[PDB]
């Protein structure tokens, strides 16, 4: 998980909504509700900041070339789907589809929408598949995907010839593993539970809050 729901609770309306006498009695407490408003605004700006720090890490917007020759490696399952209104991948679409008031509490929309986050992810993916690690340390320098895989293999101490002799087999295993990831992510939604519960907790919190409006 990266961010929470940017909730903002109006102090004066929550405690003394549409009541002048209650607000006059609350004024005898000084700056409590103002300081909790400051705290929640700080929470919201911290959520926006962590989102920006997580996703806005590249200076340029990278795209894959019209050629899809990656040495047998199929990336159409994690590359953007040009036919969707939201430029997200198929697996990202499955993920988004597999995840589930008037008393002064509102929810502010995030600064970075889902489409911009998907475009960030697509740019980073194109960069890492077509330039290795050069686009992070500097400019995106084109490298054939087979040679990038050879570099990744040399990075762990296995010679590039071991990759070349089993290049087709490695590509087939990678494609089968991507298909298995698709099947596992589409079959069960518990894998992303570490996120859903969070929302639930927040929701539950809000619930408790409004429930405390019924106490005497």
């Amino acid at each position: 998980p990266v961010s929470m729901t940017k909730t903002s609770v109006d102090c004066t309306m929550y405690i003394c909504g549409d009541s002048t006498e209650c607000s006059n009695l609350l004024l005898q407490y000084g700056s409590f509700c103002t300081q909790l408003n400051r705290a929640l605004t700080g929470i919201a700006v911290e959520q926006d900041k962590n989102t920006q720090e997580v996703f806005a890490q590249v200076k340029q917007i990278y795209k894959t070339p019209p050629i899809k020759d990656f040495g047998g490696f199929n990336f159409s399952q994690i590359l953007p789907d040009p036919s969707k209104p939201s430029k997200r991948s198929f697996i990202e679409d499955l993920l988004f589809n597999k995840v589930t008031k008037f008393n002064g509490l509102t929810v502010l929309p995030p600064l970075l929408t889902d489409e911009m986050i998907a475009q960030y992810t697509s740019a980073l993916l194109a960069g890492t598949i077509t330039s290795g690690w050069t686009f992070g340390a500097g400019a995106a320098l084109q490298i054939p995907f087979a040679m990038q895989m050879a570099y990744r293999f040399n990075g762990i101490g296995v010679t590039q010839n071991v990759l070349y002799e089993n290049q087709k087999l490695i590509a087939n295993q990678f494609n089968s593993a991507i298909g298995k990831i698709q099947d596992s992510l589409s079959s069960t939604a518990s894998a992303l539970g570490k996120l859903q519960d969070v929302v639930n907790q927040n929701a539950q919190a809000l619930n408790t809050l409004v429930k405390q409006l019924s106490s005497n």
């Binding site: 926006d48 806005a56 590249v58 200076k59 340029q60 917007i61 990278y62 795209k63 894959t64 070339p65 050629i67 020759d69 040495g71 502010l108 929309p109 995030p110 600064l111 970075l112 929408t113 911009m116 475009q119 960030y120 740019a123 194109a126 960069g127 077509t130 330039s131 050069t134 500097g138 400019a139 995106a140 320098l141 084109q142 490298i143 054939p144 995907f145 087979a146 040679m147």
Partner: protein
């Protein structure tokens, strides 16, 4: 001079179709700035410069020159 966005109602800022880097964040991808005669403008924030790579299976971009840079990290 009224603009309706998913963040709410913005009065006083002129809506510009051109995208720029976010200066004052408003929300839902909308950001505000002060630009030209000068006035407050609202715009969809840019995500960076568009740069495609000249990828192929027999081409390498190799650096012929380098630079030594220094960055400041405050903590």
């Amino acid at each position: 001079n009224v603009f309706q966005t998913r963040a709410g109602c913005l009065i006083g800022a002129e809506h510009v179709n051109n995208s720029y880097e976010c200066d004052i964040p408003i929300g839902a991808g909308i950001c505000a700035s002060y630009q030209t005669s000068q006035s407050i403008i609202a715009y969809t924030m840019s995500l960076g410069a568009e740069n495609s790579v000249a990828y192929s299976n027999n081409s390498i971009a190799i650096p012929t020159n380098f630079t030594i840079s220094v960055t400041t990290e405050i903590l």
